[PDB]
Amino acid sequence: PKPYVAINMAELKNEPKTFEMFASVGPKVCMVTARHPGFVGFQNHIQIGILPFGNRYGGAKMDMTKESSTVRVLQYTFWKDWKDHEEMHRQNWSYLFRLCYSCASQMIWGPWEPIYEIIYANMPINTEMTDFTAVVGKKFAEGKPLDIPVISQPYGKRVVAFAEHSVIPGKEKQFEDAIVRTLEMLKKAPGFLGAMVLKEIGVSGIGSMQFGAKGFHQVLENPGSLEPDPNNVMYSVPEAKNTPQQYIVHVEWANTDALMFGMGRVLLYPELRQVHDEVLDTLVYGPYIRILNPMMEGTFWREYLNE
Amino acid sequence: PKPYVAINMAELKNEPKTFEMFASVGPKVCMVTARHPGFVGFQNHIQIGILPFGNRYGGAKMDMTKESSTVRVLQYTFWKDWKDHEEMHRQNWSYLFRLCYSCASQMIWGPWEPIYEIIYANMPINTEMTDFTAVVGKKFAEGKPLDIPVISQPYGKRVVAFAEHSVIPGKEKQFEDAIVRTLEMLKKAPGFLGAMVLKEIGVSGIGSMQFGAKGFHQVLENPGSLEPDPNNVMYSVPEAKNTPQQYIVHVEWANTDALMFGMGRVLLYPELRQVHDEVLDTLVYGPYIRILNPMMEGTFWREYLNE
Amino acid sequence: PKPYVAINMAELKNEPKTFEMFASVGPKVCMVTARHPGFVGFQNHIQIGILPFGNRYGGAKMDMTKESSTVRVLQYTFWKDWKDHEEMHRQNWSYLFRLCYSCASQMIWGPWEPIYEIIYANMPINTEMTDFTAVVGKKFAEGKPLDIPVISQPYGKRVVAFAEHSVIPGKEKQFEDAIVRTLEMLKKAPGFLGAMVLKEIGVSGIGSMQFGAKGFHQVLENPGSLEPDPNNVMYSVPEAKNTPQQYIVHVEWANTDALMFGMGRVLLYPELRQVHDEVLDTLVYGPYIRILNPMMEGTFWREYLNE
Amino acid sequence: PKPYVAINMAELKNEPKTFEMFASVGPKVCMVTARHPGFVGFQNHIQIGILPFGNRYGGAKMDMTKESSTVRVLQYTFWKDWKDHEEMHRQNWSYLFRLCYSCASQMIWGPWEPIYEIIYANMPINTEMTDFTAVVGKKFAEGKPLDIPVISQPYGKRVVAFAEHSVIPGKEKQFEDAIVRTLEMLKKAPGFLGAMVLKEIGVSGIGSMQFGAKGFHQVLENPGSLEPDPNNVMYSVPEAKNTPQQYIVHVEWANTDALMFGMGRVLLYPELRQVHDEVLDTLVYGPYIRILNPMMEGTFWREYLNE
Ligand SMILES: [Fe+3]
Ligand SMILES: [Fe+3]
Numbered sequence A, B, C, D: 001p002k003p004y005v006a007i008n009m010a011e012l013k014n015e016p017k018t019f020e021m022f023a024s025v026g027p028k029v030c031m032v033t034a035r036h037p038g039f040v041g042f043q044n045h046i047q048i049g050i051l052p053f054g055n056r057y058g059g060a061k062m063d064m065t066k067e068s069s070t071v072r073v074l075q076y077t078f079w080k081d082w083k084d085h086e087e088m089h090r091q092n093w094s095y096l097f098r099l100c101y102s103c104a105s106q107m108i109w110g111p112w113e114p115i116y117e118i119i120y121a122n123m124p125i126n127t128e129m130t131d132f133t134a135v136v137g138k139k140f141a142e143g144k145p146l147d148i149p150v151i152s153q154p155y156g157k158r159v160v161a162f163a164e165h166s167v168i169p170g171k172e173k174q175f176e177d178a179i180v181r182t183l184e185m186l187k188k189a190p191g192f193l194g195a196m197v198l199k200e201i202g203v204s205g206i207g208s209m210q211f212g213a214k215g216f217h218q219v220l221e222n223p224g225s226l227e228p229d230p231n232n233v234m235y236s237v238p239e240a241k242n243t244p245q246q247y248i249v250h251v252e253w254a255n256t257d258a259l260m261f262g263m264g265r266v267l268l269y270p271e272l273r274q275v276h277d278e279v280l281d282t283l284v285y286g287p288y289i290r291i292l293n294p295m296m297e298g299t300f301w302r303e304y305l306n307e
């Protein structure tokens, strides 16, 4: 079934010390998260660049890692129910706060952790190139060769287009209907590895280190080993839901060229351009497209999705 | 009287060609904006860094200009009525679009142009160090020594704390009352040069290059000398107003140390800390504090303000 | 069905500034071209080299990119009807001229845009290496395993043999019959990815910036933002059709070794050599064989082709 | 059927002279070992690193080869009956001792040669990427598509997780049952190439150069061309079996990322974590996980295994 998604977002200094702490503390945070039975997996991304849209963002390119002074992370965790995320943070707060607080020396912005519902998903399980023979064998044995997926390789061996959209109030249904029609056509582009549409339902104050006064002072004054009062979060998840309504259109691709020309199909192929124009008419903001590398992940999230 | 404020925000590559285009294009844009009789002035900022709050943003410093790969600009224009902003943009679209388009080669994000009402202002006129003798003489000559301002030096000779806040729905009045009480106390800190509170009322689609499908394709396809259809903006300014409600607390300071310890007064001086705690209890997001240099400005906006 | 093909040809300086403008302006031109509902896609090439044919062109090699002072581009656009190409240019001339004129600073020769009919096509859809599993599954589910194509990878991951031929007047049928027999045999060569035969039907004067006197002056005097009169083209497409008749034999290959030995099959395999000798007897000029890299492309042209 | 496994373990200087000895001596030893009809194959490994378990072994990483002063080898030989290994050594002692002695100059620790029974195996035959087309063909031809294996590439083109465990006396059955459940679930991880559990039954004194006094003096005094008395081994294989009982859990993976996150599935996927917790409760020692590269091998051992 469709899980809910929490996306923890932050911007950190682009230096070895940051990647060192990703490698030490990141696994620990994931192990802590996995203590909760409602956790169904994760997909952790680094932003490598920004899609330039010709020269609309002429200062950007799809891979800016060499030049950029910062690194943005977008850490997706998947949950049977979004309340499971809120419970896990609170049940495991002494570990999680002290783990996440160790990233402080490297932080420039964040953490900020919006929560989403998945309103559309066309996403395969991941497979390594070594796996495909057995997958094909099994699908033919089951008499379902139509269910043989594309090869979507895990652990940094594909790329993601993370397309931000905010929608005019009243135009949500028009956006949702048109984006799904768009993505159903998009899937014909070479190197398409799957797509999903995330609709924001709110924000996790605790995941965002956003407390009332007491907890704010506790964060600022922390030696690193003392939890802020987790009951000093002043707002529930839905209270922070944005209007204009926010969506992420998340599309996965074999490589950055497939991403550039494949996402470009919505502009270059007249039939699809006409459908996608119905999306564009509904927007307050976007599409703004970040190029992400899914590096560290728990691929069983897709197994849950496709149950 | 209080003007409305439009703040055009963008992120560009941090390199010489960018600052060269600020020098070419920026003055031209301001001159075009001044064709409208409702224009009352401008204050254009570059972000120099981010307030670290001890080590909460431990990768940040107040001056990050030597290491950052990007530069963020925040261009304030002041208007008798916010509709004047919208009218100026449409009436001068040929010039403005083609001027702003020249910046595309350097752009990474933006433009994004929220519009604000000023709900509180304690801001002086600017004066150079050479002016103060005549100001003092003139105020004493008219029997108004209370109207002698601090010396708030124009053109890059002071610094701004730009503090972003978003507020729990329903707590807008509590925030507003609390922040004004806070700023009325803050004005005792040494080096304090004034403060104002901006409350978002909406977003200029045209200023943000956010059109429907027709205008989006015109933007992406543009050789630089053809206008997108300015009538293809699909939402009004208020239709884009965010909930949670967004505010900017804008506080000016003599220098960055005065800024750090001055804004710090709300954490360090117990009586003020108690008042400011009432602000903190209302927030969804923030305070996140950008450090800005007001470089290019039309100082007469303050003359209008203080009329 | 078989579309028509326009091939825009030019030679430019082989320097970064040329490739910078390909990345900036190329996409804009494609987006403009896609405004016409008769546009069915595109395949844009850079010439990497020339086939030496032993040492017949002993100064050449298949990859000359490191040494060459120029770069030749051959931009294929595909059209339901060739008249569509002519309408598209006229209907969108404001944008298109101004975009293409921005290439001026780098141009040495061109543009020159002959138009072709396809008289023979054996060309597959493109697929990425990730896609093949699903393609195989679908064709078996459909009971059409015979229709499983080779893997012809998009976006610079294969090579093209572009073989120019001109034919003795009166021998066009003999050429056409012999070249098809030849290509039907050539498809056995390892790494063969498809072939088509293009027969020239004329030249687009507008696409070649070839006007009467009035438009010629307008081109030469242009500051960059003023279109020449698109109605000052003095000849229709068919009026410029060459005699001797020109053809392109376009053959795609997995890599340059497969290209060299595979194309060489017409010389090395006696049974094929006998068939291809019938082609050679009909020529005025050729075969002259350029080695091309298909970098930017709209792969959906093959979908139209194969319906 | 399941063979028995002898694992010869040694630590040598990490310098070129060592790898030169591997290249000349190693193939000779394997040829001698092949003189016995009970020899069913071999798989020889170098340790490339150690799994850090987050930062539990924070000084380790998966590939330590550039920094390490030593190199550990783990040479697996597979035997129809374990007694065959013992007989082979005695029958071929003049050659083997003299061959193994020539490694002396490079040795820091070892040799040490425990013998194992295989209590669980899910291991495929190895195939090169060239082979898979024919394997698929044959399996479909015999109506067994379910038996198409993953592609497990020989000769250094995959990696091995070598997980050491020692088990509380009396908890052997619990460990064995829970480890099998764990590996049956682990096989769903991307990149999984097979697993087996080895249970120690004893140690080969002769393979370990572990003699009584007579043979010890002979080894120490050896010019290189005189055998120690092979009848001076003082203990049988089972007499050296350890309590606490030792096991190796040997898991093969496409690459080190698949190994890291895949082995990690036992910590990150809640359903598998619960199962693996049952293994963890049984341990005296471990899991301690060496990362191995299987470079030189006699792949036919898996053919024997899978008959
Ligand atoms: Fe979270
Ligand atoms: Fe504006």
Ligand SMILES: [Fe+3]
Binding pocket: C006, C008, C077, C085, C089, C113, C204, C207
């Ligand atoms: Fe053309």
Ligand SMILES: [Fe+3]
Binding pocket: D006, D008, D077, D085, D089, D113, D204, D207
């Ligand atoms: Fe042995």
